[PDB]
């Protein structure tokens, strides 16, 4: 009918680990973003966990601006009680929505214009105390019998260990989907695994959820590795290339602009985790 671009399913992600902005940069980054939000950043105690939730931000302000087409210094972003960000009510979509993750050293997004959408980003570690079987002991509460059954499958401790962050993301992305933030019983969800091994550069489609014991057919799932120690899950409620785009900071600030005057208290107030020797 319209002489107007669709928008389709957005994958993006930024590495925010590597990502080692000049203090001009850093300060006009804190400049353009919501007042509250500044406030939230300003008391992180670790610039890692500044720059994180930072590159989410202005994520979620590029994808607002040039896939709605709105100016940047008039999105109004709003978060649900249980802390969610959505854009506040009226674009002309059915049911546009995204959702950010961010750890290690990336942040993600996934949005759509239909699709309720979800997204979680884990990394594989060793267990910061006791062994592999242990740590699993102390989180068994958190998958069903037969999941733990296909984790616990593999001869590989380490291959286990990657098994578990998998299916972890899976459940964190259905929850985030929804929106209900803690208290979610994770005994309620069921996901079998498939292909049982990734590789990087691939995205795959295959695995299933089962919620209280019945499959849920209207959920899928897309899973890749954005590098050999990353697991994403995006989950999808009801031509296409889902591979994530890695975005740099030029590419955070192509619709950017100033909102707040510079603030320079927001310079030289983080710790740094090379200042600590990491260990728990
Ligand atoms: C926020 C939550 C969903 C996850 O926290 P987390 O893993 O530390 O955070 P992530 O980096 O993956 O995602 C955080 C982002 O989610 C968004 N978010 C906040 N609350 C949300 C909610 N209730 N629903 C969906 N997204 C939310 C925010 O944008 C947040 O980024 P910000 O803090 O920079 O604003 C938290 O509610 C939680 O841990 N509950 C689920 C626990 C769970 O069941 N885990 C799976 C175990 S198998
Ligand atoms: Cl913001
Ligand atoms: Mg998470």
């Known amino acids: 009918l319209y002489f107007q671009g669709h928008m389709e399913g957005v994958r993006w992600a930024f590495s925010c680990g590597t990502w080692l902005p000049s203090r001009a940069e850093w300060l006009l980054a804190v400049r353009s973003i919501q007042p509250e939000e500044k406030e939230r950043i300003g008391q992180f105690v670790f610039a890692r966990d500044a720059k994180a939730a930072m590159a989410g931000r202005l994520m979620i302000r590029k994808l607002v601006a040039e896939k709605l087409n709105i100016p940047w210094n008039h999105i109004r972003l709003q978060r649900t009680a249980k802390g969610k960000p959505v854009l506040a009510k009226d674009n002309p979509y ?6 950010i993750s961010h750890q290690g050293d990336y942040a993600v997004l ?67 989907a ?61 031509p296409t290339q889902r591979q994530f785009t890695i975005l740099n900071f030029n590419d955070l600030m192509s619709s950017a602009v100033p909102m707040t005057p510079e603030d320079p208290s927001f310079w ?6 090379e200042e600590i020797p990491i260990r728990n």
């Not at 208290?183 to 919620?211: A, C």
């Not at 030289?268 to 985790?273: G, I, M, S």
């Open 110 to 176: 996934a949005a759509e214009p239909e699709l309720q959408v979800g997204i979680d980003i884990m990394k594989t570690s060793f267990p910061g105390r006791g062994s592999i079987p242990e740590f699993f002991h102390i989180m068994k509460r958190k998958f069903t019998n037969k999941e733990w059954e296909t984790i616990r499958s593999f001869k590989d401790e380490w291959t286990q260990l990657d098994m578990f962050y998998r299916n972890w993301a899976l459940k964190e992305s259905f929850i985030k």
């Open 268 to 273: 030289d107030c983080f710790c740094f985790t």
């Open 178 to 238: 929804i929106g209900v933030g803690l208290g979610f019983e994770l005994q309620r969800l069921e996901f079998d695994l498939s292909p049982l091994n990734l590789d990087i550069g691939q995205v795959y489609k295959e695995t299933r959820l089962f919620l209280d014991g019945e499959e849920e057919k209207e959920w899928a799932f897309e899973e890749s590795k954005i590098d050999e120690h990353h697991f994403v899950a995006v989950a999808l409620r009801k």
């Open 94 to 99: 059915p049911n546009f929505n995204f959702n």
